[PDB]
Amino acid sequence: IRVGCHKLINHHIFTNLILVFIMLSSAALAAEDPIRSHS
């Protein structure tokens, strides 16, 4: 079925969790050590 997953895609709770996960992953990229690769 292509409506059960559509309901989750257009869900109010799911479209904001994916938005906050993008910012969390973006912040996780800016806390890396550029010098010490074996850190």
UniProtKB/Swiss-Prot annotation:
It is found in: Membrane. The chain crosses the membrane at residues 13-31. Expressed in pancreatic islets and in brain, where it has been seen in cerebral cortex, hippocampus, basal ganglia, habenula and thalamus. Expressed in the small cell lung carcinoma cell line SCC-9. No expression in skeletal muscle. Voltage-dependent calcium channels are multisubunit complexes, consisting of alpha-1, alpha-2, beta and delta subunits in a 1:1:1:1 ratio. The channel activity is directed by the pore-forming and voltage-sensitive alpha-1 subunit. In many cases, this subunit is sufficient to generate voltage-sensitive calcium channel activity. The auxiliary subunits beta and alpha-2/delta linked by a disulfide bridge regulate the channel activity. Channel activity is further modulated, depending on the presence of specific delta subunit isoforms. Each of the four internal repeats contains five hydrophobic transmembrane segments (S1, S2, S3, S5, S6) and one positively charged transmembrane segment (S4). S4 segments probably represent the voltage-sensor and are characterized by a series of positively charged amino acids at every third position. Voltage-sensitive calcium channels (VSCC) mediate the entry of calcium ions into excitable cells and are also involved in a variety of calcium-dependent processes, including muscle contraction, hormone or neurotransmitter release, gene expression, cell motility, cell division and cell death. The isoform alpha-1D gives rise to L-type calcium currents. Long-lasting (L-type) calcium channels belong to the 'high-voltage activated' (HVA) group. They are blocked by dihydropyridines (DHP), phenylalkylamines, and by benzothiazepines. Belongs to the calcium channel alpha-1 subunit (TC 1.A.1.11) family. CACNA1D subfamily. It is linked to Sinoatrial node dysfunction and deafness: A disease characterized by congenital severe to profound deafness without vestibular dysfunction, associated with episodic syncope due to intermittent pronounced bradycardia. Primary aldosteronism, seizures, and neurologic abnormalities: A disorder characterized by hypertension, hypokalemia, and high aldosterone levels with low plasma renin activity and an elevated aldosterone/renin ratio. Other features include generalized seizures, cerebral palsy, spasticity, intellectual disability, and developmental delay. This is Voltage-dependent L-type calcium channel subunit alpha-1D.
